[PDB]
């Protein structure tokens, strides 16, 4: 049933249980020849009164980061939220799908400098993406969250709020385009953010907080959105701290 469970797409996944359903899997144009180059472990996620507001994704691999950027380019995303550090191991938890200052090129896409101001619990990164059938790109701002522990689940709900507050705002002029959220598998930490994003918008636009029917919607769209059932209580924990300010 699932295209991600194809022998050709096996390697392209970081976690076996977390694969995108075929109804909302994010598709890319096939490359060079035909066959198997339209797959990326990612899926569109609805938000508060917005169909497909996010792209719940797994952190790339470089034997796959180009499919990560192609994904990003094809779907006009100007916001990248990374909820992890490249390392807590077994392996490369993710990226450096962005430059350590050089001008890294991934096939037809080129990313570049400008990106470094360090906020409280996250570093903001302004990149300049360009294709090869040319078009420089939407000063793609990358929000790297560092306020998330390698073990347990965060302290006080801020950082995530001053960061969620950062993402929803840049998305204004950027053209209200999908936000790429990703951790390592793109379910627990990615699903929480998405969940927190949604519930936080309904609250300040309807005063209601469906922190469950919501997490409920998230599941039906991607395996285990909001796994460890404490990271969640955290959703409610952060859903309280926002009301008191």
PDB file of N, CA and C in Angstrom, residues 104-181:
ATOM      1  N   UNK A 104      27.379  25.287  -0.314  1.00  0.00           N
ATOM      2  CA  UNK A 104      27.138  23.896  -0.636  1.00  0.00           C
ATOM      3  C   UNK A 104      26.088  23.787  -1.735  1.00  0.00           C
ATOM      4  N   UNK A 105      26.365  22.931  -2.712  1.00  0.00           N
ATOM      5  CA  UNK A 105      25.474  22.705  -3.843  1.00  0.00           C
ATOM      6  C   UNK A 105      25.019  21.249  -3.814  1.00  0.00           C
ATOM      7  N   UNK A 106      23.725  21.033  -4.002  1.00  0.00           N
ATOM      8  CA  UNK A 106      23.151  19.690  -4.000  1.00  0.00           C
ATOM      9  C   UNK A 106      22.417  19.464  -5.322  1.00  0.00           C
ATOM     10  N   UNK A 107      23.168  19.146  -6.373  1.00  0.00           N
ATOM     11  CA  UNK A 107      22.552  18.935  -7.669  1.00  0.00           C
ATOM     12  C   UNK A 107      22.099  20.262  -8.254  1.00  0.00           C
ATOM     13  N   UNK A 108      20.792  20.443  -8.411  1.00  0.00           N
ATOM     14  CA  UNK A 108      20.270  21.688  -8.972  1.00  0.00           C
ATOM     15  C   UNK A 108      19.986  22.813  -7.955  1.00  0.00           C
ATOM     16  N   UNK A 109      20.127  22.531  -6.660  1.00  0.00           N
ATOM     17  CA  UNK A 109      19.866  23.539  -5.622  1.00  0.00           C
ATOM     18  C   UNK A 109      21.113  23.996  -4.843  1.00  0.00           C
ATOM     19  N   UNK A 110      21.246  25.312  -4.678  1.00  0.00           N
ATOM     20  CA  UNK A 110      22.377  25.912  -3.965  1.00  0.00           C
ATOM     21  C   UNK A 110      21.949  26.757  -2.766  1.00  0.00           C
ATOM     22  N   UNK A 111      22.465  26.413  -1.593  1.00  0.00           N
ATOM     23  CA  UNK A 111      22.148  27.107  -0.347  1.00  0.00           C
ATOM     24  C   UNK A 111      23.342  27.998   0.048  1.00  0.00           C
ATOM     25  N   UNK A 112      23.118  29.087   0.787  1.00  0.00           N
ATOM     26  CA  UNK A 112      24.241  29.953   1.158  1.00  0.00           C
ATOM     27  C   UNK A 112      24.099  30.837   2.405  1.00  0.00           C
ATOM     28  N   UNK A 113      25.216  31.494   2.728  1.00  0.00           N
ATOM     29  CA  UNK A 113      25.429  32.400   3.867  1.00  0.00           C
ATOM     30  C   UNK A 113      24.339  33.372   4.294  1.00  0.00           C
ATOM     31  N   UNK A 114      24.671  34.122   5.358  1.00  0.00           N
ATOM     32  CA  UNK A 114      23.839  35.177   5.962  1.00  0.00           C
ATOM     33  C   UNK A 114      23.142  34.830   7.275  1.00  0.00           C
ATOM     34  N   UNK A 115      22.809  33.563   7.402  1.00  0.00           N
ATOM     35  CA  UNK A 115      22.066  32.995   8.519  1.00  0.00           C
ATOM     36  C   UNK A 115      22.523  32.934   9.996  1.00  0.00           C
ATOM     37  N   UNK A 116      23.181  33.916  10.585  1.00  0.00           N
ATOM     38  CA  UNK A 116      23.432  33.565  11.969  1.00  0.00           C
ATOM     39  C   UNK A 116      23.258  34.521  13.126  1.00  0.00           C
ATOM     40  N   UNK A 117      22.077  34.469  13.729  1.00  0.00           N
ATOM     41  CA  UNK A 117      21.775  35.285  14.888  1.00  0.00           C
ATOM     42  C   UNK A 117      21.255  34.296  15.910  1.00  0.00           C
ATOM     43  N   UNK A 118      21.821  34.299  17.114  1.00  0.00           N
ATOM     44  CA  UNK A 118      21.390  33.349  18.130  1.00  0.00           C
ATOM     45  C   UNK A 118      20.428  33.893  19.157  1.00  0.00           C
ATOM     46  N   UNK A 119      19.194  33.413  19.093  1.00  0.00           N
ATOM     47  CA  UNK A 119      18.188  33.829  20.040  1.00  0.00           C
ATOM     48  C   UNK A 119      18.425  33.030  21.309  1.00  0.00           C
ATOM     49  N   UNK A 120      17.426  33.054  22.171  1.00  0.00           N
ATOM     50  CA  UNK A 120      17.427  32.356  23.447  1.00  0.00           C
ATOM     51  C   UNK A 120      17.665  30.851  23.309  1.00  0.00           C
ATOM     52  N   UNK A 121      16.599  30.146  22.932  1.00  0.00           N
ATOM     53  CA  UNK A 121      16.605  28.696  22.781  1.00  0.00           C
ATOM     54  C   UNK A 121      16.670  28.181  21.340  1.00  0.00           C
ATOM     55  N   UNK A 122      17.083  29.037  20.412  1.00  0.00           N
ATOM     56  CA  UNK A 122      17.210  28.643  19.016  1.00  0.00           C
ATOM     57  C   UNK A 122      18.073  29.619  18.236  1.00  0.00           C
ATOM     58  N   UNK A 123      18.689  29.122  17.169  1.00  0.00           N
ATOM     59  CA  UNK A 123      19.520  29.958  16.311  1.00  0.00           C
ATOM     60  C   UNK A 123      18.761  30.127  15.004  1.00  0.00           C
ATOM     61  N   UNK A 124      18.676  31.361  14.523  1.00  0.00           N
ATOM     62  CA  UNK A 124      17.973  31.649  13.277  1.00  0.00           C
ATOM     63  C   UNK A 124      18.961  31.616  12.117  1.00  0.00           C
ATOM     64  N   UNK A 125      18.623  30.919  11.040  1.00  0.00           N
ATOM     65  CA  UNK A 125      19.525  30.870   9.910  1.00  0.00           C
ATOM     66  C   UNK A 125      18.897  31.279   8.579  1.00  0.00           C
ATOM     67  N   UNK A 126      19.345  32.421   8.053  1.00  0.00           N
ATOM     68  CA  UNK A 126      18.904  32.958   6.761  1.00  0.00           C
ATOM     69  C   UNK A 126      19.744  32.387   5.615  1.00  0.00           C
ATOM     70  N   UNK A 127      19.116  31.572   4.779  1.00  0.00           N
ATOM     71  CA  UNK A 127      19.809  30.954   3.652  1.00  0.00           C
ATOM     72  C   UNK A 127      19.334  31.529   2.322  1.00  0.00           C
ATOM     73  N   UNK A 128      20.164  31.379   1.297  1.00  0.00           N
ATOM     74  CA  UNK A 128      19.802  31.850  -0.026  1.00  0.00           C
ATOM     75  C   UNK A 128      19.805  30.640  -0.962  1.00  0.00           C
ATOM     76  N   UNK A 129      18.611  30.087  -1.180  1.00  0.00           N
ATOM     77  CA  UNK A 129      18.435  28.916  -2.032  1.00  0.00           C
ATOM     78  C   UNK A 129      18.232  29.337  -3.480  1.00  0.00           C
ATOM     79  N   UNK A 130      18.855  28.603  -4.397  1.00  0.00           N
ATOM     80  CA  UNK A 130      18.766  28.899  -5.821  1.00  0.00           C
ATOM     81  C   UNK A 130      18.670  27.609  -6.613  1.00  0.00           C
ATOM     82  N   UNK A 131      17.876  27.618  -7.679  1.00  0.00           N
ATOM     83  CA  UNK A 131      17.724  26.437  -8.517  1.00  0.00           C
ATOM     84  C   UNK A 131      18.715  26.523  -9.693  1.00  0.00           C
ATOM     85  N   UNK A 132      18.574  25.640 -10.680  1.00  0.00           N
ATOM     86  CA  UNK A 132      19.443  25.639 -11.855  1.00  0.00           C
ATOM     87  C   UNK A 132      18.542  25.469 -13.069  1.00  0.00           C
ATOM     88  N   UNK A 133      17.852  26.579 -13.298  1.00  0.00           N
ATOM     89  CA  UNK A 133      16.849  26.901 -14.310  1.00  0.00           C
ATOM     90  C   UNK A 133      16.338  27.957 -13.334  1.00  0.00           C
ATOM     91  N   UNK A 134      17.347  28.747 -12.968  1.00  0.00           N
ATOM     92  CA  UNK A 134      17.406  29.853 -12.016  1.00  0.00           C
ATOM     93  C   UNK A 134      16.309  30.720 -11.421  1.00  0.00           C
ATOM     94  N   UNK A 135      16.418  30.823 -10.099  1.00  0.00           N
ATOM     95  CA  UNK A 135      15.558  31.627  -9.251  1.00  0.00           C
ATOM     96  C   UNK A 135      16.071  31.565  -7.814  1.00  0.00           C
ATOM     97  N   UNK A 136      16.625  32.682  -7.346  1.00  0.00           N
ATOM     98  CA  UNK A 136      17.140  32.780  -5.986  1.00  0.00           C
ATOM     99  C   UNK A 136      15.926  32.530  -5.110  1.00  0.00           C
ATOM    100  N   UNK A 137      16.115  32.222  -3.836  1.00  0.00           N
ATOM    101  CA  UNK A 137      14.928  31.910  -3.077  1.00  0.00           C
ATOM    102  C   UNK A 137      14.605  32.439  -1.718  1.00  0.00           C
ATOM    103  N   UNK A 138      13.326  32.782  -1.643  1.00  0.00           N
ATOM    104  CA  UNK A 138      12.628  33.256  -0.471  1.00  0.00           C
ATOM    105  C   UNK A 138      13.545  33.211   0.749  1.00  0.00           C
ATOM    106  N   UNK A 139      14.399  34.225   0.944  1.00  0.00           N
ATOM    107  CA  UNK A 139      15.328  34.213   2.083  1.00  0.00           C
ATOM    108  C   UNK A 139      14.842  33.155   3.081  1.00  0.00           C
ATOM    109  N   UNK A 140      15.100  31.891   2.735  1.00  0.00           N
ATOM    110  CA  UNK A 140      14.652  30.781   3.555  1.00  0.00           C
ATOM    111  C   UNK A 140      15.311  30.818   4.916  1.00  0.00           C
ATOM    112  N   UNK A 141      14.495  31.135   5.915  1.00  0.00           N
ATOM    113  CA  UNK A 141      14.947  31.242   7.288  1.00  0.00           C
ATOM    114  C   UNK A 141      14.772  29.882   7.951  1.00  0.00           C
ATOM    115  N   UNK A 142      15.856  29.405   8.553  1.00  0.00           N
ATOM    116  CA  UNK A 142      15.873  28.125   9.241  1.00  0.00           C
ATOM    117  C   UNK A 142      15.881  28.391  10.733  1.00  0.00           C
ATOM    118  N   UNK A 143      14.921  27.800  11.427  1.00  0.00           N
ATOM    119  CA  UNK A 143      14.839  27.952  12.864  1.00  0.00           C
ATOM    120  C   UNK A 143      15.369  26.660  13.450  1.00  0.00           C
ATOM    121  N   UNK A 144      16.538  26.729  14.067  1.00  0.00           N
ATOM    122  CA  UNK A 144      17.113  25.555  14.682  1.00  0.00           C
ATOM    123  C   UNK A 144      16.828  25.678  16.169  1.00  0.00           C
ATOM    124  N   UNK A 145      16.041  24.750  16.708  1.00  0.00           N
ATOM    125  CA  UNK A 145      15.710  24.786  18.122  1.00  0.00           C
ATOM    126  C   UNK A 145      16.769  24.024  18.900  1.00  0.00           C
ATOM    127  N   UNK A 146      17.272  24.647  19.962  1.00  0.00           N
ATOM    128  CA  UNK A 146      18.308  24.048  20.791  1.00  0.00           C
ATOM    129  C   UNK A 146      17.812  23.945  22.214  1.00  0.00           C
ATOM    130  N   UNK A 147      16.577  24.385  22.416  1.00  0.00           N
ATOM    131  CA  UNK A 147      15.982  24.334  23.731  1.00  0.00           C
ATOM    132  C   UNK A 147      15.364  22.987  24.047  1.00  0.00           C
ATOM    133  N   UNK A 148      15.656  21.964  23.241  1.00  0.00           N
ATOM    134  CA  UNK A 148      15.121  20.625  23.495  1.00  0.00           C
ATOM    135  C   UNK A 148      16.202  19.647  23.956  1.00  0.00           C
ATOM    136  N   UNK A 149      16.013  19.055  25.145  1.00  0.00           N
ATOM    137  CA  UNK A 149      16.957  18.097  25.726  1.00  0.00           C
ATOM    138  C   UNK A 149      17.067  16.771  24.978  1.00  0.00           C
ATOM    139  N   UNK A 150      18.222  16.133  25.133  1.00  0.00           N
ATOM    140  CA  UNK A 150      18.501  14.845  24.518  1.00  0.00           C
ATOM    141  C   UNK A 150      17.776  13.751  25.284  1.00  0.00           C
ATOM    142  N   UNK A 151      17.378  14.070  26.513  1.00  0.00           N
ATOM    143  CA  UNK A 151      16.684  13.120  27.374  1.00  0.00           C
ATOM    144  C   UNK A 151      15.549  13.753  28.173  1.00  0.00           C
ATOM    145  N   UNK A 152      14.449  13.012  28.307  1.00  0.00           N
ATOM    146  CA  UNK A 152      13.295  13.505  29.038  1.00  0.00           C
ATOM    147  C   UNK A 152      12.417  14.365  28.144  1.00  0.00           C
ATOM    148  N   UNK A 153      12.104  15.575  28.603  1.00  0.00           N
ATOM    149  CA  UNK A 153      11.283  16.518  27.851  1.00  0.00           C
ATOM    150  C   UNK A 153      11.452  17.891  28.518  1.00  0.00           C
ATOM    151  N   UNK A 154      11.779  18.927  27.724  1.00  0.00           N
ATOM    152  CA  UNK A 154      12.002  20.321  28.131  1.00  0.00           C
ATOM    153  C   UNK A 154      11.462  20.822  29.483  1.00  0.00           C
ATOM    154  N   UNK A 155      12.136  21.845  30.008  1.00  0.00           N
ATOM    155  CA  UNK A 155      11.803  22.469  31.290  1.00  0.00           C
ATOM    156  C   UNK A 155      10.527  23.305  31.258  1.00  0.00           C
ATOM    157  N   UNK A 156      10.703  24.606  31.046  1.00  0.00           N
ATOM    158  CA  UNK A 156       9.606  25.563  30.988  1.00  0.00           C
ATOM    159  C   UNK A 156       9.237  25.869  29.549  1.00  0.00           C
ATOM    160  N   UNK A 157       7.936  25.786  29.282  1.00  0.00           N
ATOM    161  CA  UNK A 157       7.369  26.006  27.961  1.00  0.00           C
ATOM    162  C   UNK A 157       7.802  27.147  27.062  1.00  0.00           C
ATOM    163  N   UNK A 158       8.746  27.983  27.485  1.00  0.00           N
ATOM    164  CA  UNK A 158       9.174  29.072  26.612  1.00  0.00           C
ATOM    165  C   UNK A 158      10.295  28.590  25.690  1.00  0.00           C
ATOM    166  N   UNK A 159      10.608  29.391  24.678  1.00  0.00           N
ATOM    167  CA  UNK A 159      11.631  29.010  23.722  1.00  0.00           C
ATOM    168  C   UNK A 159      10.842  28.372  22.608  1.00  0.00           C
ATOM    169  N   UNK A 160      10.025  27.400  22.987  1.00  0.00           N
ATOM    170  CA  UNK A 160       9.164  26.712  22.048  1.00  0.00           C
ATOM    171  C   UNK A 160       8.074  27.688  21.619  1.00  0.00           C
ATOM    172  N   UNK A 161       7.732  28.616  22.509  1.00  0.00           N
ATOM    173  CA  UNK A 161       6.692  29.605  22.235  1.00  0.00           C
ATOM    174  C   UNK A 161       7.272  30.836  21.553  1.00  0.00           C
ATOM    175  N   UNK A 162       8.473  31.221  21.957  1.00  0.00           N
ATOM    176  CA  UNK A 162       9.093  32.373  21.345  1.00  0.00           C
ATOM    177  C   UNK A 162       9.610  31.935  19.976  1.00  0.00           C
ATOM    178  N   UNK A 163       9.641  30.621  19.747  1.00  0.00           N
ATOM    179  CA  UNK A 163      10.098  30.065  18.474  1.00  0.00           C
ATOM    180  C   UNK A 163       8.893  29.767  17.586  1.00  0.00           C
ATOM    181  N   UNK A 164       7.836  29.248  18.192  1.00  0.00           N
ATOM    182  CA  UNK A 164       6.631  28.966  17.443  1.00  0.00           C
ATOM    183  C   UNK A 164       6.152  30.345  17.017  1.00  0.00           C
ATOM    184  N   UNK A 165       6.391  31.333  17.879  1.00  0.00           N
ATOM    185  CA  UNK A 165       6.006  32.719  17.611  1.00  0.00           C
ATOM    186  C   UNK A 165       6.828  33.297  16.457  1.00  0.00           C
ATOM    187  N   UNK A 166       8.018  32.738  16.264  1.00  0.00           N
ATOM    188  CA  UNK A 166       8.916  33.175  15.200  1.00  0.00           C
ATOM    189  C   UNK A 166       8.484  32.616  13.847  1.00  0.00           C
ATOM    190  N   UNK A 167       8.160  31.325  13.827  1.00  0.00           N
ATOM    191  CA  UNK A 167       7.737  30.638  12.610  1.00  0.00           C
ATOM    192  C   UNK A 167       6.432  31.173  12.014  1.00  0.00           C
ATOM    193  N   UNK A 168       5.390  31.268  12.835  1.00  0.00           N
ATOM    194  CA  UNK A 168       4.094  31.750  12.365  1.00  0.00           C
ATOM    195  C   UNK A 168       4.147  33.164  11.820  1.00  0.00           C
ATOM    196  N   UNK A 169       5.133  33.935  12.254  1.00  0.00           N
ATOM    197  CA  UNK A 169       5.247  35.305  11.790  1.00  0.00           C
ATOM    198  C   UNK A 169       5.998  35.458  10.474  1.00  0.00           C
ATOM    199  N   UNK A 170       7.118  34.750  10.318  1.00  0.00           N
ATOM    200  CA  UNK A 170       7.876  34.839   9.071  1.00  0.00           C
ATOM    201  C   UNK A 170       7.051  34.258   7.956  1.00  0.00           C
ATOM    202  N   UNK A 171       6.155  33.365   8.319  1.00  0.00           N
ATOM    203  CA  UNK A 171       5.337  32.760   7.310  1.00  0.00           C
ATOM    204  C   UNK A 171       4.335  33.762   6.730  1.00  0.00           C
ATOM    205  N   UNK A 172       4.221  34.954   7.327  1.00  0.00           N
ATOM    206  CA  UNK A 172       3.295  35.964   6.786  1.00  0.00           C
ATOM    207  C   UNK A 172       3.821  36.353   5.412  1.00  0.00           C
ATOM    208  N   UNK A 173       4.799  37.258   5.365  1.00  0.00           N
ATOM    209  CA  UNK A 173       5.386  37.567   4.078  1.00  0.00           C
ATOM    210  C   UNK A 173       6.416  36.473   3.943  1.00  0.00           C
ATOM    211  N   UNK A 174       6.123  35.595   3.004  1.00  0.00           N
ATOM    212  CA  UNK A 174       6.902  34.436   2.623  1.00  0.00           C
ATOM    213  C   UNK A 174       5.827  33.871   1.708  1.00  0.00           C
ATOM    214  N   UNK A 175       4.595  34.314   1.962  1.00  0.00           N
ATOM    215  CA  UNK A 175       3.463  33.905   1.157  1.00  0.00           C
ATOM    216  C   UNK A 175       2.584  32.818   1.733  1.00  0.00           C
ATOM    217  N   UNK A 176       2.573  32.682   3.053  1.00  0.00           N
ATOM    218  CA  UNK A 176       1.753  31.663   3.703  1.00  0.00           C
ATOM    219  C   UNK A 176       2.009  30.278   3.101  1.00  0.00           C
ATOM    220  N   UNK A 177       3.285  29.903   2.999  1.00  0.00           N
ATOM    221  CA  UNK A 177       3.702  28.612   2.444  1.00  0.00           C
ATOM    222  C   UNK A 177       3.999  27.595   3.554  1.00  0.00           C
ATOM    223  N   UNK A 178       3.884  26.290   3.252  1.00  0.00           N
ATOM    224  CA  UNK A 178       4.134  25.217   4.225  1.00  0.00           C
ATOM    225  C   UNK A 178       5.419  25.380   5.039  1.00  0.00           C
ATOM    226  N   UNK A 179       5.374  24.933   6.288  1.00  0.00           N
ATOM    227  CA  UNK A 179       6.516  25.021   7.193  1.00  0.00           C
ATOM    228  C   UNK A 179       7.097  23.629   7.355  1.00  0.00           C
ATOM    229  N   UNK A 180       8.368  23.464   7.022  1.00  0.00           N
ATOM    230  CA  UNK A 180       8.969  22.150   7.166  1.00  0.00           C
ATOM    231  C   UNK A 180       9.484  21.928   8.576  1.00  0.00           C
ATOM    232  N   UNK A 181       8.773  21.062   9.286  1.00  0.00           N
ATOM    233  CA  UNK A 181       9.133  20.711  10.650  1.00  0.00           C
ATOM    234  C   UNK A 181       9.724  19.315  10.556  1.00  0.00           C
TER     235      UNK A 181
END
